Amino acid sequence: LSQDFVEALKAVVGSPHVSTASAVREQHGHDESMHRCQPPDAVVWPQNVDQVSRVASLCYNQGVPIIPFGTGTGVEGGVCAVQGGVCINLTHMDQITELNTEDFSVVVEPGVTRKALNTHLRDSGLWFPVDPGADASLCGMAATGASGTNAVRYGTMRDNVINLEVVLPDGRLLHTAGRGRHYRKSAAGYNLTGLFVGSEGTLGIITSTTLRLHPAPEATVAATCAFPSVQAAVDSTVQILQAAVPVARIEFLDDVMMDACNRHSKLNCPVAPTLFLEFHGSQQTLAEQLQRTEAITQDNGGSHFSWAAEKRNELWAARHNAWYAALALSPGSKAYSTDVCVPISRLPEILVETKEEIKASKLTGAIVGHVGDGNFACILLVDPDDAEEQRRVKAFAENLGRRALALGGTCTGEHGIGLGKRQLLQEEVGPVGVETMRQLKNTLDPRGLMNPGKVL
Numbered sequence: 305l306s307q308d309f310v311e312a313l314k315a316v317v318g319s320p321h322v323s324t325a326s327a328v329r330e331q332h333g334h335d336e337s338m339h340r341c342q343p344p345d346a347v348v349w350p351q352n353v354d355q356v357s358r359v360a361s362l363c364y365n366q367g368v369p370i371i372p373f374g375t376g377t378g379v380e381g382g383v384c385a386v387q388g389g390v391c392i393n394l395t396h397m398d399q400i401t402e403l404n405t406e407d408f409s410v411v412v413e414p415g416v417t418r419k420a421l422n423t424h425l426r427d428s429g430l431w432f433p434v435d436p437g438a439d440a441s442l443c444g445m446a447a448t449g450a451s452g453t454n455a456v457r458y459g460t461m462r463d464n465v466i467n468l469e470v471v472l473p474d475g476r477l478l479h480t481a482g483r484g485r486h487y488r489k490s491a492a493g494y495n496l497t498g499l500f501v502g503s504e505g506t507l508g509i510i511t512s513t514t515l516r517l518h519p520a521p522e523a524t525v526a527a528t529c530a531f532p533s534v535q536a537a538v539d540s541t542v543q544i545l546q547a548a549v550p551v552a553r554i555e556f557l558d559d560v561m562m563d564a565c566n567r568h569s570k571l572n573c574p575v576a577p578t579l580f581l582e583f584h585g586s587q588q589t590l591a592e593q594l595q596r597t598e599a600i601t602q603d604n605g606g607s608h609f610s611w612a613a614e615k616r617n618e619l620w621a622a623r624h625n626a627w628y629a630a631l632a633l634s635p636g637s638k639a640y641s642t643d644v645c646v647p648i649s650r651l652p653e654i655l656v657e658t659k660e661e662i663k664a665s666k667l668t669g670a671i672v673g674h675v676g677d678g679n680f681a682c683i684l685l686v687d688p689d690d691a692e693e694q695r696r697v698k699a700f701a702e703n704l705g706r707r708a709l710a711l712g713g714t715c716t717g718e719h720g721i722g723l724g725k726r727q728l729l730q731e732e733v734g735p736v737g738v739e740t741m742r743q744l745k746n747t748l749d750p751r752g753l754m755n756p757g758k759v760l
């Protein structure tokens with residue numbers, strides 16, 4: 305990367321906001337997955353959207369790849385600089401604006417996390433529900449198409465992103481639904497917002513997100529329920545969904561995951577395949593939901609509910625840190641994770657099969673999942689130096705992905721494709737799907753400089 309180019313970057317954002325130091329680049333060359341670190345040639349911190357536009361235009365016209373970087377909590381290698389280039393860390397733009405409580409909407413910049421937003425909203429009676437375990441950038445969550453434990457009731461990022469401000473690869477500024485606009489529904493033209501949700505930094509740089517807010521629930525009850533088998537826990541889940549109980553949260557942990565979370569968070573749940581549950585409503589509707597849900601879990605051998613502000617907060621903090629609980633089983637390890645999502649009636653087959661396949665192998669694996677969406681993760685601990693085991697883990701993940709595709713599902717419910725699932729995506733949507741996706745990529749990023757090597 306030439307000295308003249310570095311000076312041009314510094315002229316846009318300021319000398320302190322450009323770094324070519326090896327240690328700084330290495331810290332921005334990896335995320336939380338096992339994908340090996342590939343450092344960008346420079347890291348740049350733009351201070352406003354005009355600077356984002358000017359950095360993008362500079363890189364684009366000089367043939368330098370651009371890698372958007374939020375909080376670096378992704379798990380598919382999205383920020384790995386496989387072709388070098390400039391990593392654009394967006395988190396100094398951290399303002400909340402256009403809070404419209406009467407319309408249930410707010411605008412956030414990339415440095416705003418879910419925790420920051422919900423702190424800003426206390427005593428408003430509103431909250432933002434999409435809750436990945438990590439303290440991630442909300443714009444990064446829009447870029448990956450994230451979901452969370454609350455999505456079963458309150459929707460994913462795709463359901464809750466109303467508008468996006470995007471710097472396109474050559475620097476033009478796009479407001480996907482129109483500048484300043486916010487509304488419940490529209491048929492006006494093609495829905496551009498949905499195209500950029502889940503684009504993972506390959507179509508442009510999200511510099512603000514307009515988010516749907518939700519009313520805080522009148523009352524909340526959380527509980528855990530232990531089961532004799534994975535089959536019994538997942539059968540209960542499917543039957544709760546088929547009975548249309550509007551559960552707020554329904555999370556599955558297998559016995560390995562439950563033990564790991566016990567050791568990592570000082571929960572003391574019985575070591576068993578377990579559902580973490582949460583219900584929202586008035587006392588009238590809560591009693592009803594609890595009736596019907598306990599009836600179904602009882603039929604499948606579930607325990608009497610172990611009830612859980614502080615202990616509920618402990619419970620979900622433990623769930624949100626399950627990834628790190630899994631890592632603590634094998635200290636010094638990184639992990640890869642599957643993330644399939646299947647038609648819910650096929651969820652029992654594939655989780656029970658996954659549990660059986662994990663035991664039939666020497667692999668360490670923990671299972672946790674948004675099973676209310678028909679989605680789950682197998683978190684696979686890897687020694688960073690054991691090449692044999694690492695290709696056993698990638699082969700396991702590949703096979704599980706193809707099993708989900710055989711059942712009519714998808715290879716990723718929320719984490720994305722990044723570097724790891726590109727072959728699975730080709731199988732998932734076929735040749736005409738791949739070409740159509742590539743044609744959209746090419747019109748927005750003709751030079752292929754927008755996070756190259758990812759997704760397609």
Ligand SMILES: Cc1cc2nc3c(=O)[nH]c(=O)nc-3n(C[C@H](O)[C@H](O)[C@H](O)COP(=O)(O)OP(=O)(O)OC[C@H]3O[C@@H](n4cnc5c(N)ncnc54)[C@H](O)[C@@H]3O)c2cc1C
Nearest residue numbers: 374375376377378382436437444445447450451505510718
């Ligand atoms: C403990 C743990 C728990 C998690 N739980 C969940 C979960 O329940 N659900 C879930 O969906 N994910 C989960 N994740 C994954 C991760 O938190 C999400 O994918 C999150 O959306 C990533 O945001 P980020 O800013 O940290 O991404 P980064 O790693 O910074 O970036 C991810 C990708 O998005 C791109 N990108 C980032 N910001 C922008 C932007 N502003 N504009 C354009 N492209 C951008 C990057 O180029 C990259 O390709 C978890 C991760 C961890 C470590």
